[PDB]
Symmetry: C2
Subunit: 671 residues, 2 copies
């Protein structure tokens, strides 16, 4: 069945065959609630409570016969070592003997309590849906507090070392957290998990090792959380993303920080021991010791089945196959001598695609420059800037500026009507271009989407890859017309009168920014890619907690780190990155500027430049523009990046193959 | 009519008499839309229109009502283009055209009317009549969003022409719409009621004041009071009338469109803030002080007194009203700080005596009734901001720390703590059943949820003041303490880097005894600094996690102990020194050897590791693990920027106008 269904209508296939009937759900969940109530009446004096685990506990049940557990927290279980007191199977057998005699209300028709080793099991069934609850007894480890505070995991590690160590055997104690991690998530994410489990069951059915579905449930949750936080995604992107992750099984290493952190040294040493292991490494959200991935041999079969389904003609039907961008292994886990491989494999965009968008953008520039003004004698001049014009774009979220210079604009400010006219006519000419030239480009073109107050934007997409670049169109005063100080006196006469944030006129000087980072060694552009990725990973979790300083400040720290540390075309990337995290740690003393375009030679430039150098302790003046002050002194949450850098200095990335630490370069902090 | 309506059912009275009919509104607004469309068809000089007045703000009363609409003629290009009268010629041509230009039904409901300095147009429908003043303006906003350069160009033009403060304010009418459109419906109903009352006062008395001043005052009353989009309208009325009665103090302003950042604007605001009060700066033009003739506020005071004291208000003895200050601390001169603290920040002494008498009854009843079966009784210790003498008039809090023998360690005791708090909840319910009339203060029944802290509040019978207590089971660590107790805490933290102080409540007695018994002058400075912090938190909390309030109480004590250990001092120098220390947040390292000391083998070993922490570090004098001034953890950077802004304040200028210097306090100790 499954492989014959096209990628479109998979949501229908899931609704038609996999998802449980709402009728059976609304009977069984009342059955289970009644069971949970009856086991908690004082009848059963020994229970503190119950918690529900397995596929039922996670709310991921399939239409068929299905997995579940429920855990009884007996009050004589008070320590982790009580998990080893196996004689509680006697207690479970008494619980069975009692429970089977209750059969309360109508439910006597639908229970079937059954004898089993190491305690009983209760099945619950209905016309279609059937649940097979494994019954277990455990210490409620969570009752040591009301949250997974670090002392709980410290007591866990101590208990593991005191008894005979058996990693993950006590994970059952945390079943309450396992519910909390899987509720309040989108319905489509559940439907995707059901589809992935159904495929796994088909693979288990035809192949004749074993792997628990919880590993692929975690993998699917990680795929969604990293790739597409939207609650209305396309399931056919989800499947392709998960199968791409499974194909990477020898790299795969996924973990969550939702219940535990690298803060406590006792947990940090556990995570650093586990994260540095045989990939596929799958740490569960609730127990730092419980590596969920099964026998390595089973992932070989899952690879072969992933290849087989992913290459089928029912997938792979789009010209580029759409999928989310997720890394099999976060940067933190990669050893220091593998950084140069990591950058080349995951961060660099494809060279042929950049050549294609360069060829396309010169066509865009040529078509616009001739057509936008025909009545007026003054033509627009379009200059290309941003992260694709210099060679430092990432494979994801690339950007570009098309700065548009024109004679309508007489000053940096007070010209909104002229800029609106320039944008409107560029929008009209881009529409005419899309009408006339659609098949002459070797890249796909999104039609411009625009509204009167917003910036123009359009995107160029590969025809054979997922990569894309987004351009935005920015009218600017042609200040430049290295520049002589009579141009900078124009900016200075705006700011000299008051304290203000800098740099809103940055786009006027885009050529000096591009020419500052371009022509530098490719090794340094790759280090700039690495630092921009590290910053992107910081923003992913610190943005809820503050406004981080702008990325260009760390691009400038990366260049200052190279120029001061070692001005050589080839170097160890791990020492460069370690030095950048050193400079970010030293944020308390940041005095950086470059006398490339502006110097103390002029009477007003010197007067202004000697002022900004005393504005605030952190100061990183844009080499294109003295008012730029992009390392803003007192406004931005530098502290958060300094705390995160101080955390990252523990990373595997900064340990050599011998295991000894990698030192920073000796860079001055004031310059 | 109005004065006979009780405070309850004012919402009914507003719905019954004041609010316009929706059946009428749904014609007039389409009439105005059609007029605005016709005026924007090239009428080739009209770049656009914006609607001002009571219609523009969406505050129209049922009857005849005020409005304007502004025409942005394309030849108007600088502020001084307001001054050339020829706009009346252009208006008279626009009149001549627009009187002939009519469409569909609308000829039955327009009435264009000749007027001096340009025409006017009326629009009327069943039970309604809008009158529009028609004006010409340079659309100053077209320059940028109200960016600093716009107000710099404004001030330059104002000085270049024959200066006329507020005369260019018509240019900003689009911002005046943007400030009023989004706000909650009941705030509109309150504004309608306040305007109807003002019209009744204008009717019987026989100066004048424009309603925009009282509309701004009502918006400020709501924005400073309850931010809630649902409220009792009679609290709104009572707090607005209380603000009007304070007319000689009143000074209200907004930072929504302009800031003290740009020196050209800062000098305007500092000039305006120090003016005849009631000072009412409008949200959109820093020069447009909206308050009318000073004489009119005398009449408004007398009418506020008359209505507020009526038997239809003032019916509930603890008459509820939102606590809003007539004048923000920033506006008060330095030599008036000692008066400001005493007038607005100190709670009433008799109320504190009453809650002290009541809480000793609570403690006695709980201590005897809770464990009757067990031999071990609970011990209840009172702590927090009311036990030391540093509570504010608003948002006071206190801890009832409960010590018991069930608790054998700082951690892993949740069931015992749940039992203790559950039975305290039961005994507080029994107390409320038995003793409700023996207290001289009102008691809220405890409101509780199984995982949450238990809490209850004591309220005055005769004032709005209140105190909130919460009940906190704690390990009886103390049982000055000898180091064998601190070795217990140290053996938890020594093994790892962690945030500190989660066990702070165990040492509450050492915290209270540190701030208590200090001079009352220093407790009033602590009140002032806690108010400054509360005002910083009011606007910076959306932007980051501010450092905890207890850190600034310790900076205030360190500032006094180092600056001048004398029972009386200038409060303005103390506050200036606290803002100095907050500016030098990079260097704190502030601690006190009052309880712990280096005279031990483990405490010294831990404390020399605590001293070797982030440069900004403040150690709770009660507890070496307290470390209440965290480093990167907190958003100190923001308070150090706000302090640098506050150093311009009138509070730090003497009566001669010279600046007040800080005390010479060391930053490392
Ligand atoms: Zn912050």
């Amino acid at each position: 069945q499954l492989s014959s269904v096209p990628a479109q209508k998979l949501g229908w296939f899931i609704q038609e065959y996999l998802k449980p009937y709402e009728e059976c759900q609304t009977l069984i969940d009342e059955m289970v609630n009644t069971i949970c109530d009856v086991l908690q009446e004082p009848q059963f004096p020994l229970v503190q409570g119950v918690a529900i685990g397995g596929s039922y506990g996670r709310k991921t049940v399939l239409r068929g016969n299905s997995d579940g557990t429920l855990v009884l927290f007996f009050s004589d279980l008070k320590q982790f070592q009580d998990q080893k007191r196996s004689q509680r199977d006697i207690l479970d057998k008494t619980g069975d003997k009692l429970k089977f005699c209750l059969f309360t209300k109508w439910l006597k028709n639908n229970f079937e309590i059954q004898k089993s080793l190491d305690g009983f099991t209760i099945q619950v069934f209905t016309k279609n849906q059937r649940i097979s609850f494994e019954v277990l007894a455990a210490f409620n480890a969570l009752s040591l507090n009301d949250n997974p505070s670090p002392w709980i995991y410290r007591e866990l590690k101590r208990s593991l070392d005191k008894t005979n160590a058996s990693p993950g055997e006590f994970a059952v104690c945390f079943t309450e957290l396992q519910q909390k991690f899987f509720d309040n998530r989108p319905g489509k994410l559940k439907d995707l998990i059901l589809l992935i489990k159904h495929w796994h069951q088909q693979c288990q059915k035809k192949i004749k090792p074993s792997l628990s579905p919880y590993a692929l449930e975690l993998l699917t949750v990680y795929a969604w959380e990293q790739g597409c936080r939207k609650d209305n995604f396309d399931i056919a992107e989800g499947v392709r993303t998960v199968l791409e992750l499974i194909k990477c099984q020898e790299k795969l290493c996924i973990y969550w920080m939702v219940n535990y952190n690298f803060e406590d040294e006792t947990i940090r040493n556990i995570l650093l021991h586990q994260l540095q292991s045989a990939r596929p490494v799958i740490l569960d959200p609730v127990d730092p010791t419980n590596n969920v991935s099964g026998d390595k041999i089973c992932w070989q079969w899952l690879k072969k089945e992933a290849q087989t389904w992913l290459t089928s003609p029912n997938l792979d039907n789009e010209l580029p196959a759409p999928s989310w961008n997720v890394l099999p292994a976060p940067l933190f886990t990669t050893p220091g001598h593998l950084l140069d491989k990591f950058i080349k494999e995951f961060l660099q965009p494809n060279k042929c695609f950049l050549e294609q968008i360069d060829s396309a953008v010169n066509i865009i520039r040529t078509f616009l420059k001739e057509n936008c003004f025909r009545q007026s004698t003054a033509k627009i001049q379009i200059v290309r800037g941003g992260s694709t014009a210099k060679g430092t774009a990432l494979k994801t979220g690339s950007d570009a500026d098309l700065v548009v210079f024109h004679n309508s604009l007489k000053s940096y400010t007070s010209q909104k009507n002229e800029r609106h006219k320039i944008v409107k006519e560029i929008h009209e000419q881009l529409k005419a271009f899309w009408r006339e030239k659609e098949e002459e480009l070797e890249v796909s073109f999104e039609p411009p989407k625009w509204k009167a107050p917003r910036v123009l934007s359009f995107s160029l997409k590969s025809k054979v890859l997922n990569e894309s670049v987004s351009f935005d169109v920015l009218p600017a005063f042609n200040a430049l017309g290295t520049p002589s100080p009579e141009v900078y006196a124009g900016l200075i006469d705006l700011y000299k009168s008051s304290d203000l944030p800098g740099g809103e006129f940055s786009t006027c000087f885009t050529v000096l920014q591009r020419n500052f980072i371009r022509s530098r060694p490719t090794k340094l552009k790759d280090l700039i890619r690495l630092v921009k990725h590290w910053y992107k990973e910081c923003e992913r979790k610190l943005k809820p907690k503050g406004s981080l300083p702008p990325k260009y400040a760390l691009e400038l720290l990366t260049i200052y780190a190279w120029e001061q540390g070692s001005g050589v075309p080839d170097f160890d990337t791990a020492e460069g990155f370690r030095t950048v995290l050193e400079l970010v740690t030293q944020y308390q003393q940041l005095c950086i500027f470059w006398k490339v375009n502006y110097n103390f030679e002029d009477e007003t430039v010197r007067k202004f430049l000697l002022s900004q150098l005393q504005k605030t302790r952190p100061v990183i003046l844009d080499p294109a523009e003295p008012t730029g002050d992009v390392g803003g002194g007192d406004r931005w949450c530098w502290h958060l990046l300094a705390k995160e850098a101080k955390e990252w200095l523990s990373s595997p990335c900064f340990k050599d193959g011998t295991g000894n630490p990698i030192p920073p370069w000796k860079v001055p902090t004031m310059q």
